[PDB]
Amino acid sequence: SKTGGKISFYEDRNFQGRRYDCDCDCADFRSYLSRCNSIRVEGGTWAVYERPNFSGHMYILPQGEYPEYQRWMGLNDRLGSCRAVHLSSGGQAKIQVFEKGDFNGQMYETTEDCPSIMEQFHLREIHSCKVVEGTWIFYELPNYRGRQYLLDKKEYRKPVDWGAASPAIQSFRRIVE
Q1: 52-86: b or e for each residue (b if 16 or more CB lie within 10 Å)?
Q2: Which of 8, 13, 43, 57 has its CA 20 to 30 A from that of 26?
Q3: Rounded distance, CA 15 to CA 13, Å?
Q4: Cα dihedral angle (144, 158, 112, 65), rounded to 10 degrees?
Q5: Sequence-ordered list of residues with C-beta below 8 angstroms from that of 25, at least 6 positions apart, any chain
Q6: Domains of the chain
Q7: Rounded CA gap, 114 and 13, in Å?
Q8: C-alpha to C-alpha distance for 63 and 80, rounded to whole angstroms
Q9: CA dihedral defined by 54, 55, 61, 62, rounded to 10 degrees?
């Protein structure tokens, strides 16, 4: 009955050393593991953070096996908390973006991923956006690179409403499966 996603962290490379298995979000795993240099994802998609309380660098990990941290693009082997990412299906994911805050300025509507916002819409920044269909991720650098943020069916009127300290956004993609 306890069906769910599962991730395993190993203190040494090649899944060697002490191992820890988690089946739910954990705000502080420091008491069970002092470091993690490799990870195995058996099911589900998870977000890992460099420091406790989902803070510091954040990385999205889909199901799969990573015998070494570099295979997950980790900056180092420090991980203090992890959360399971829930995927929403339904039909066609839809997002709208506005040039000014409070949904003002020019508006653009799209149902597909965008690798470079400036190349597609000639926009250098985005100050408001309404996502209400499926889940969407935004990335600070083109080609889905840099810090990434998970967006749910929500209405964002200010850039800080996205947890971002600046209205800078260069690419976004829809999450499926």
Answers
A1: eebeeebbebeeeebbbbeebebeebbbbbbbbbe
A2: 13
A3: 5
A4: 40
A5: 81, 82, 83, 84
A6: 1-87 (2.60.20.10), 88-177 (2.60.20.10)
A7: 35
A8: 20
A9: 40
